[PDB]
Amino acid sequence: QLRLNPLLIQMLSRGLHEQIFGCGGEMPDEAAVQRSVEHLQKHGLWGQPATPLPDVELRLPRLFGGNLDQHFRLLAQKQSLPYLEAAASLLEAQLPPEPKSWAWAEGWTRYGPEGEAEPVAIPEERALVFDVEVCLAEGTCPTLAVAISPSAWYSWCSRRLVEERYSWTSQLSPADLIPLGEQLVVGHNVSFDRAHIREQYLIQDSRMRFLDTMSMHMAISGLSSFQRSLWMGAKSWDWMDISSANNLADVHNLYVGGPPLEKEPRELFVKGSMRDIRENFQDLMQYCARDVWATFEVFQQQLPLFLERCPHPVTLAGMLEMGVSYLPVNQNWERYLTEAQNTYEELQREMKKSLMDLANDACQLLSGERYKEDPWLWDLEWDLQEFKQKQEDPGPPSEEEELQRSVTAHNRLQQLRSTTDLLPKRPQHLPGHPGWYRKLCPRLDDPAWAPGPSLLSLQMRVTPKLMALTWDGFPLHYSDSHGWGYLVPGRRDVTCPYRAIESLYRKHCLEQGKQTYHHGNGPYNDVNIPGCWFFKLPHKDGNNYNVGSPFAKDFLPKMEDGTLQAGPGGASGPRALEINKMISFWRNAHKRISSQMVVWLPRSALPRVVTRHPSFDEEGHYGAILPQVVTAGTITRRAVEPTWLTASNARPDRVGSELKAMVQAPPGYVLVGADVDSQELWIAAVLGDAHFAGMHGCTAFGWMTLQGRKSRGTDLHSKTAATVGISREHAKIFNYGRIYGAGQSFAERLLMQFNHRLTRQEAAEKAQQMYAVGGTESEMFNKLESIAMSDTPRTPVLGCCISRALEPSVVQGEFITSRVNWVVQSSAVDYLHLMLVAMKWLFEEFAIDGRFCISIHDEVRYLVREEDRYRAALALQITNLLTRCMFAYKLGLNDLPQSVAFFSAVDIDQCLRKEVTMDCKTPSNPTGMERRYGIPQGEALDIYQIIELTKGSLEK
Amino acid sequence: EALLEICQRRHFLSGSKQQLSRDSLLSGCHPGFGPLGVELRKNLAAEWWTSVVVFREQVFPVDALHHKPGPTSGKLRENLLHGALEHYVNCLDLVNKRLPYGLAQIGVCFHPVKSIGEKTEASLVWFTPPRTSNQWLDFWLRHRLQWWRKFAMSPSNFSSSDCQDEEGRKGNKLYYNFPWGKELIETLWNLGDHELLHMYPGNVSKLHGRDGRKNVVPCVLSVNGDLDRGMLAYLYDSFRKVLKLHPCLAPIKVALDVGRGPTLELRQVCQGLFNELLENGISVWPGYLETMQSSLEQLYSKYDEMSILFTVLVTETTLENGLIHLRSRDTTMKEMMHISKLKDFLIKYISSA
Amino acid sequence: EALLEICQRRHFLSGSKQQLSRDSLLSGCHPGFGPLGVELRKNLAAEWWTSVVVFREQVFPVDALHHKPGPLSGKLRENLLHGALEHYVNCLDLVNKRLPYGLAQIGVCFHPVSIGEKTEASLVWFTPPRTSNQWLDFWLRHRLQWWRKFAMSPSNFSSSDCQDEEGRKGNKLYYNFPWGKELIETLWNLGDHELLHMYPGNVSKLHGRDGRKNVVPCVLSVNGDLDRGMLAYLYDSFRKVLKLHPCLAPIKVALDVGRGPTLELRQVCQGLFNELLENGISVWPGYLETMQSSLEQLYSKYDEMSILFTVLVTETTLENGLIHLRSRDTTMKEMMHISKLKDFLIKYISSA
DNA sequence: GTCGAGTCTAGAGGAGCT
DNA sequence: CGGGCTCCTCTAGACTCGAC
Ligand SMILES: Nc1ccn([C@H]2C[C@H](O)[C@@H](COP(=O)(O)OP(=O)(O)OP(=O)(O)O)O2)c(=O)n1
Ligand SMILES: [Ca+2]
């Protein structure tokens, strides 16, 4: 079984190479082999021996087609046929005019000829153009929808719109969604519209696929984010006429160019109420129909161009599968939300106490104008606005005396109540407090009013002044042109008190043990605070950036070091930094996470496997979140989702960062998945190898990438990390910056940021050594730039073209870095498409009960049946093998090394956590997953364990 | 200590300096509390009751007697736990044998010191299914610690410590970082059903509580706060000499005053306002009855040492335009407010705190 | 008999059926009170506090310990009077030695019978001897008014004059229980004797400012049993319905649920329950029950528990928001909007 | 007629992920 | 020339509308 490359690389075993690449491989060019050996020994890499990995014998399923490419093309065609048929039928359809009067009934209504509305249970069509309107006021329920069929027009109205009721249940169920059922549903940003179809939430997958015109626009003529900013600012420059923003207005104006598409100015769904929508029903339905028609036009103008520029059937057959993502949740989701919000509120309230105390004690400086000598609160607005206008014991009182005194005091009090008329109708807000203090206190009219300066936070520009922060014995100071700095005293060229600052620095230098005398980011004398020098704070991104807050996570090392100190002293500044670092993520992401649309499956909708499992709680609720993924949201055609592709991994200190761990498979199901090992690194290495000599590891970079393992710690990431001293997860950033055009200064800054021990000189020397290296990775760079500079850059594997906005004909040498990165990133997207096609083929062929769950780029999760976890793991290993072999085949290599042929580990867990051996202990989850929710640690299996468990057979 | 002098002078404590030492205050041998310490402790008890008993469908009050009758002769109770267990079977009729449920109490417990010390302690006895005992213990640990930290100026002084019993029973211990050291203010114990079976010998079908569809003998959990040491912790926490007690814990909220004249109309207005605030649950210090007229600086210092949230000054001008002078303990900034709106602002300030 | 059976069953009087006795309830030697009895006594104590301490600027709370150490070998306190006198000298600082002023307390007092403890409400009034009898009559009138205020039949709360063994005048209050009049409060004009005894020599400390001159003040003791007052009001209130006063009844509104779906209707019930509690209305969470009894049986049970109103949430409450509202006193059923309920209840409690 | 509060928007800087 | 994205809060400017 053992086989070797001409450069002594253990290649794929005989029993697998014969089944995949077939016999008859030509002998490699001996001149090329000698050239590669000379190149390897030029950099001192030839002659290093590697251990022979145990060869794998496996009976692969029949790869019909003739070779790998034909096999994948046939799979993609057989998967995408019934939906391409429906899309074609949509393209060749004549539609009657939009009805003038829309039905008001509840449910689906079909408009026959002459606009005759007819109640129909569901659209009896295999192809629809869809749009769902949602009233944000009430919640996340669908409000109304209009659908376009090849024959008729359809409209949908909900109970919560046609029917009035005091209360509607807040927990969504599939009984208040849109019933749409080999169906195809077309729409612009159809991920939003998919989430409101009731059959998309069952575990058993109905054969429905969704086509997105937003994704097709991004594929055909997408635009970079910087190019997005330039295009918006305007609204060579020829690209501004072949590309547009992702709005249906701009997309329609680009592809179709008809009369401008008009949106409703009132925004009765975003900023309106249910009564406002019952009032303007016909207007909103007609706007919905106009948008559906614009989507139909854009689809007609887009389907040809997409198949022209993305002609491989695998691209579409994978984009169809990448839009049926499915996350199952349970009652632990609500617990997670409540616990994370409560912990966030606790820590925020602690910090607010600490700051509001400092605010209140500073108002006492107003008496006597003492703030003028405060080196922090001297430049604030300390103004007061005036109020505006238009005997011996008598004895026990008798009862009549009691009543008379009571009533007369009451009347004396109530007669003054009439003097309210002299008060202005606008109530003044804290006129007796200084100016900087009124702004911190919410007005009494606010529904969330709290006593004191309740609006204070660490990001405000007064907090580094109320905390009396100092940097190296210098008071912090803010300039409107340089961000935060500090006032180095002793310069001789409300006023700034410079004698107070000199006294403060003298006290610091005589107490701490210290001694024109300072060197820092530089005396930017444009600020010109009299009597002192304004030195800027050093920012982690360089000396050109501005620090937006001295409480950023890059200052905690400087805080603990002793340069950045708080005035109160002790653990006040460190605790402020720690709490900010703990609540940074949830502060941004709580509106996203808490507003996810969860639909709770009733016990009737759950399958028998779930309901008969001994772990099925009769009191718990099981639901599902359909991620609203845009299957192509970048110029590189990556998927985009604001929450789940941005979800944080469980950190020990981050609040709410156990988000993905709350995606827990239902009883009877397990989550089988794997992560591609050094995906883009191997892609770049194999591209360089195919460009250099046509053998794996012919280049020095390819040989370095290929030789090693992650477990042994001898892989390229770990080797680089040990070489520099940084962690592997930061060696990723370091090497990826090196590949993606980062200069040596970036490496210097990265080393100084990560490895605090390394000074400027050491980091600069190491960066120069590692970038100086006719280099180790020169062939990969040359091939990537050759692909980028060609007339029509295409992916070497599937052939998908670059966006028309990024061709060299329309751009005269600009945005070149984005184009060169597009090659590798779109190659990764092609890898993902191939994996999805192959996994779907294997599941269909060998009768594995499971469905695609989610794919966060390099990762791919499948909600497989519990009994099919090992067959699914074997299928995942086989698909990785075939994807790598196809990648090699399309590059003309005809062989695959054994090291990269299989997944390092196929995780079989009941959560979406990164590693199986993780308890996900965060401030919001201090006990852990197992203690609180009862999630046992899963198992990660290698290829050999999977073969031993499955006997190497996918059939069972 | 200056704080103890302030507490004696401002009638938070009682007795002489010799009678009020750290050990006597921490034991219960102090002569008692002043009229302000009584109200601060009442505020603590009210907040504890609100947090624990009021907003729970399952927590009920319980009446445990002060003396332990019978075996030869009786004694004085040392904890409220023992008396609460005697009501477990009777209180299963209220919850219809549903679990979990609780019994809560605030009372004085007598500890040998041979001197005798009295402590005001708030206890919750939580009967939970044995499978959920650890999760309920963690829940109550978090709930109690956040309740203690809620009114604190420095919540980091309150801490927690996971402990263990002689019988290997998991527990917890809260603390307050007093200037000398850490002192135990609360203790949560996962006792189990040993005490229930010892107290109720015989058939255990009498003790069965419904864990959903499964009857089970509950595991007992006990929480035992310390209200006397709690208010001493808050007096040390709050402490220009000012006691920055929480707006919900400050014994006195507002302090009324007067001008020089006209006395007959100003005193009628002040009596009307005084009755207005008392009818709305705002404790008032009748400073307009004082026979001695002092500089506003001295009066302000006196009111700050007593934790007075606001100082209301009614002058002859109030008779014309209805405006009063309002001062704030926290900021020392004087504002003008119409006398008709004062009660609403004060209720807003106390509730929103 | 029937009343005590109801009270024990409805958790007014905790303990065994045989363990409850008339003389055990009138002596403090009883197992204790159920949660309803505890909340009723808490209501009574709050009413006493508001009507004595809160509105009077001369009255301050006092902190007396349970035990009395030192040679007389400690001793449990038998009355709240002596602990108040020990605070007399140091509590002249609150009023700047100005007379009159008072010290009021509610606490437990241990009476030998067996040790039978009674929770008593006391007020010691330090007044100059000139106006002692006038203040005694004033307090007598006010205490009688307070006791009669909540009574459904205020004719039973009588009063009488008495002479002490030392010739000191005083008054006594009695509730006319069905078996006879039991003493629920007593007022005494004991003058200075004790203040001097407890403080022999240096009467300059005991002197109080009776206007301009300084005098030693006569003390007045008003002492009333809150436990026997609770018994008196339970007998006053008591078809088996306990018509306790709205300000004394432990639980005001009994919240309930009546139909399906369970999870949609219990969210409404929980929201209403949280709203009512935030405004200081005691609610009985009857909606948590899984096994539903007859509506008439719930009405009888809640009438026995002195719950003012019964609120029923049904299917219709989801459509138009109307809840069923039943009044304990008038046994009248009506429908009102759920948003109007809290204001209605607050105004009803305030009106009484 | 003029002036201050509510609103609305846009830019800067920080922070998640791959 | 690290790249591609996503979203958040804080601040300053501009505009509008009602009240003196
Ligand atoms: N700072 C980063 C992080 C990631 N990526 C790209 C390159 C990777 O190929 C891809 C996936 O990131 P991974 O973290 O998976 O990088 P690796 O695949 O090298 O990690 P591993 O080998 O552990 O899968 O994203 C990048 O360019 N820059
Ligand atoms: Ca990877």
B336 touches chain A (CB under 8 A): yes
A114 and A236 inside one domain? yes
Q: Of all helices (H) and strands (E), which one includes residue A250?
A: helix A248-255
Chain C residues in contact with B278 (beta carbon < 8 A): 54-55
**Ligand 1 centroid – CA A678 distance (Å):** 6
Structure tokens at A184: 């195809």
DSSP collapsed to 3 states, A371-383: HHHCCCCCCCCCC
Q: Of all helices (H) and strands (E), which one includes residue A568?
A: none
Domain covering B2-238 in this structure, CATH number: 3.30.930.10
- What lies within 8 Å, CB to CB, of A445 at 6+ separation is A427
Verify whether the Cβ–Cβ distance A171 to C263 is below 8 Å.
yes
> CB A437: neighbour CB atoms within 10 A?
23
Helix A744-754 to helix A760-772 angle, to the nearest 10 degrees? 130
- Of the candidates B32, B67, B286, the beta carbon closest to that of C57 is on B286
Q: Tell me, what amino acid is at A69?
A: D
Q: What is the dihedral of CA C214, C216, C218, C221, to 10 degrees?
A: 110
- Of the candidates B271, B320, B333, the beta carbon closest to that of A432 is on B333
CB C210, CB C130: distance < 8 Å: yes
Chain B residues in contact with A405 (beta carbon < 8 A): 271
Q: How far apart are CA A809 and CA A238, in angstroms?
A: 9
CB A466, CB A362: distance < 8 Å: yes
Which stretches within chain B are classed as H helix? 2-9, 22-27, 35-49, 81-85, 133-150, 194-199, 227-238, 263-278, 296-305, 318-321, 342-352
Q: Look up the domain containing A489 and give its range.
A: 341-382+435-589
Q: Which residues of C138-149 are buried (b: 16+ CB within 10 A; e: fewer)?
A: bbbebbbebbbe
Omega prior to C100 cis, within 30 of 0: yes
The residue whose two tokens read 């702004």 is A439
Structure tokens at A936: 């046992």
Q: Which nucleotide is nearest to A630 (CA to C1')?
A: E5
Q: Of all helices (H) and strands (E), which one includes residue A292?
A: helix A281-309
User: Is A681 close to ligand 1, i.e. is its CB under 6 Å away?
Assistant: yes
A278 located within any domain: yes
- In chain A, the residue whose alpha carbon lies closest to the alpha carbon of B244 is A357
Structure tokens at C341: 């309920």
Domain boundary among A309, A327, A359: A309
Torsion over CA: B10, B12, B14, B15 (sign): negative
A491 located within any domain: yes
> How far apart are the CA of A927 and the nearest CA of chain C, in angstroms?
29
- In chain C, the residue whose alpha carbon lies closest to the alpha carbon of B33 is C63
A351 located within any domain: yes
Name the nearest CA neighbour of C143 among C50, C79, C224, C230: C224
Q: Tell me, what amino acid is at A375?
A: P
Chain A residues in contact with C275 (beta carbon < 8 A): none
A253 and A368 inside one domain? no
Please report the number of interchain residue pairs, chain A to chain C, with beta-carbon separation below 8 angstroms.
41
Structure tokens at C322: 């109307």
- Obtained via which technique? cryo-EM
- Protein residue with least CA distance to atom 22, ligand 1: A678
Q: Tell me, what amino acid is at A442?
A: P
User: Is A645 close to ligand 1, i.e. is its CB under 6 Å away?
Assistant: no
Beta strands B170-177 and B214-216, pairing class: unpaired
Domain covering C2-237 in this structure, CATH number: 3.30.930.10
Q: How far apart are CA A56 and CA A54, in angstroms?
A: 7
**Interruptions in chain A after residues (C–N over 2.5 Å):** 181, 235, 390, 493, 515, 773
A252 and A374 inside one domain? no
Q: Which nucleotide is nearest to A642 (CA to C1')?
A: E6
Return the ligand 1 atom nearest residue A740 CA. Answer: 27
A803 located within any domain: no
> What resolution in angstroms does the PDB record give?
2.5
Q: How far apart are CA A609 and CA A447, in angstroms?
A: 49
User: Is A680 close to ligand 1, i.e. is its CB under 6 Å away?
Assistant: yes
A712 located within any domain: no
Omega prior to A574 cis, within 30 of 0: no
Identify the DSSP state of B236.
Answer: H
Ligand found nearest the CA of A828: 1
User: Is A858 close to ligand 1, i.e. is its CB under 6 Å away?
Assistant: yes
Q: What is the dihedral of CA B317, B323, B329, B334, to 10 degrees?
A: -70
Name the nearest CA neighbour of A134 among A283, A281, A270, A288: A270
C-alpha of A885 from chain center: 31
Instruction: Give the SS3 label for residue C253.
Output: strand
Identify the DSSP state of A422.
Answer: G
Has A131 been annotated as catalytic?
A: yes
CB A597, CB A140: distance < 8 Å: yes
- What lies within 8 Å, CB to CB, of A124 at 6+ separation is none
Which of A165, A334, A393, A399 to substitute to test the interface with C, most C CBs within 10 Å?
A393
Domain boundaries in chain C?
A: 2-237, 253-351
> How far apart are the CA of C138 and the nearest CA of chain B, in angstroms?
20
Q: How far apart are CA B289 and CA B294, in angstroms?
A: 13
CATH classification of the domain holding A210:
3.30.420.390
Omega prior to A174 cis, within 30 of 0: no
Structure tokens at A886: 């196809």
Which stretches within A21-103 are classed as H helix? 30-42, 68-91
**Ligand 1 centroid – CA A319 distance (Å):** 22
DSSP collapsed to 3 states, A889-944: HHCCCCCCECCCCCCCCEEEECCCCCCCCCCCCECCECCCHHHHCCCCCCEEECHH
DSSP collapsed to 3 states, A192-249: HHHCCEHHHCCCCCCCEEEEEHHHHHHHHHCCCHHHHHHHHHHCCCHHHHCCCCCCHH
- Of the candidates A350, A353, A451, the beta carbon closest to that of B352 is on A451
A114 located within any domain: yes
Strand E nucleotides, any atom under 7 Å from protein beta carbons: they are 1-12, 18-20
B7 touches chain A (CB under 8 A): no
Q: How far apart are CA A268 and CA A271, in angstroms?
A: 6
Structure tokens at C155: 């004719």
Structure tokens at A582: 């703990």
The residue whose two tokens read 């430049």 is A379
- Protein residue with least CA distance to atom 14, ligand 1: A732
A411 located within any domain: no
Chain A residues in contact with C263 (beta carbon < 8 A): 169, 171
A110 and A241 inside one domain? yes
Q: Which residue is nearest to nucleotide E12 (CA to C1')?
A: A480
CB C323, CB C336: distance < 8 Å: yes
Identify the DSSP state of B155.
Answer: G
- Protein residue with least CA distance to atom 7, ligand 1: A680
Instruction: Give the SS3 label for residue B344.
Output: helix
Q: How far apart are CA A739 and CA A820, in angstroms?
A: 10
Q: How far apart are CA A351 and CA A890, in angstroms?
A: 58
Q: How far apart are CA A538 and CA A525, in angstroms?
A: 17
Return the ligand 1 atom nearest residue A739 CA. Answer: 27
Looking at A55, A131, A238, A480, which residue is catalytic?
A: A131
CB A680, CB A824: distance < 8 Å: yes
Q: How distant is C1' of D10 from CA of A527, in Å?
A: 25
Which stretches within A755-852 are classed as H helix? 760-772, 778-789, 816-846
**Fold assignment, C253-351:** Rossmann fold (3.40.50)
Domains B2-238 and B254-352 share a fold: no
Omega prior to B262 cis, within 30 of 0: yes
Which DSSP string do the residues of A635-674 spell out, in sequence order? Answer: TT---B-TTTTTPPP--SS-TT--SGGG--PPTTEEEEEE
For residue B190, the cross-strand partners are: B221
C-alpha of A771 from chain center: 31
Mutate to test the pocket of ligand 1, among A858, A887, A899, A907 (most ligand atoms within 8 A of CB): A858
Which DSSP string do the residues of B51-74 spell out, in sequence order? Answer: IIIIT-SSEEE----SEE------
Which of A335, A357, A419 to substitute to test the interface with B, most B CBs within 10 Å?
A419
Verify whether the Cβ–Cβ distance A416 to B333 is below 8 Å.
no
Q: Distances in Å between the alpha carbon of A745 and those of A482, A554, A729, C313?
A: 22, 18, 20, 70
CA angle A280, A284, A286 (to 5 degrees): 120
User: Is A149 close to ligand 1, i.e. is its CB under 6 Å away?
Assistant: no
Which stretches within A100-181 are classed as H helix? 159-162
φ, ψ at A584 (rounded to 5°): -60, -50
User: Which chains form contacts with chain A, at 3 or more CB pairs under 8 Å?
Assistant: B, C
Structure tokens at A899: 């090291």
Q: How far apart are CA A624 and CA A203, in angstroms?
A: 9
Q: Distances in Å between the alpha carbon of A281 and those of A140, A144, A145, A161, A278?
A: 19, 10, 12, 10, 5
Q: How far apart are CA C97 and CA A498, in angstroms?
A: 54
A604 touches chain C (CB under 8 A): no
> CB A843: neighbour CB atoms within 10 A?
21
User: Is A677 close to ligand 1, i.e. is its CB under 6 Å away?
Assistant: yes
Beta strands A474-479 and A208-212, pairing class: unpaired
- What lies within 8 Å, CB to CB, of C241 at 6+ separation is C303, C304, C328
Mutate to test the pocket of ligand 1, among A676, A680, A727 (most ligand atoms within 8 A of CB): A680
Q: Distances in Å between the alpha carbon of B136 and those of A88, A617, B99, B100, B221?
A: 60, 19, 12, 9, 8
Identify the DSSP state of A90.
Answer: H
For residue C337, the cross-strand partners are: C322
CB A321, CB A631: distance < 8 Å: no
Q: Is CATH 3.40.50.800 the classification given to domain B254-352?
A: yes
Residue A504, burial from CB neighbour count under 10 angstroms (0-12, 13-18, 19+): buried
Name the nearest CA neighbour of C213 among C128, C135, C133, C136: C128
- Protein residue with least CA distance to atom 5, ligand 1: A736
- Of the candidates C100, C137, C318, the beta carbon closest to that of A393 is on C100
Structure tokens at A168: 């509607």
Q: How far apart are CA A142 and CA A131, in angstroms?
A: 10
Instruction: Give the SS3 label for residue C106.
Output: strand
Q: How far apart are CA A700 and CA A751, in angstroms?
A: 25
Structural domains in chain A (count) = 2
CB A579, CB A923: distance < 8 Å: no
> How far apart are the CA of B146 and the nearest CA of chain A, in angstroms?
8
Which stretches within chain C are classed as H helix? 2-9, 22-25, 35-49, 81-85, 132-149, 193-198, 226-237, 262-278, 295-304, 316-319, 341-351
The residue whose two tokens read 């007005």 is A443
Number of H helices, E strands in chain A: 30, 20
Own/partner pairs, C279-283, CB within 8 angstroms, 24+ separation: C279/C342, C279/C346, C281/C252, C281/C253, C281/C342, C281/C345, C281/C346, C281/C349, C282/C39, C282/C250, C282/C251, C282/C252, C282/C253, C283/C251, C283/C252, C283/C253, C283/C254, C283/C255
A465 located within any domain: yes
User: Is A732 close to ligand 1, i.e. is its CB under 6 Å away?
Assistant: yes
Q: How far apart are CA C91 and CA C82, in angstroms?
A: 14
CB A13, CB A902: distance < 8 Å: no
Q: Of all helices (H) and strands (E), which one includes residue A616?
A: none
Q: How far apart are CA A135 and CA A146, in angstroms?
A: 15
Own/partner pairs, A288-293, CB within 8 angstroms, 24+ separation: A288/A131, A288/A133, A288/A144, A288/A145, A288/A146, A289/A98, A289/A146, A289/A153, A290/A98, A290/A261, A290/A262, A291/A131, A291/A188, A291/A248, A291/A261, A292/A129, A292/A130, A292/A131, A292/A146, A292/A147, A292/A148, A293/A98, A293/A148
Name the nearest CA neighbour of C28 among C145, C108, C123: C108
Instruction: Give the SS3 label for residue C344.
Output: helix
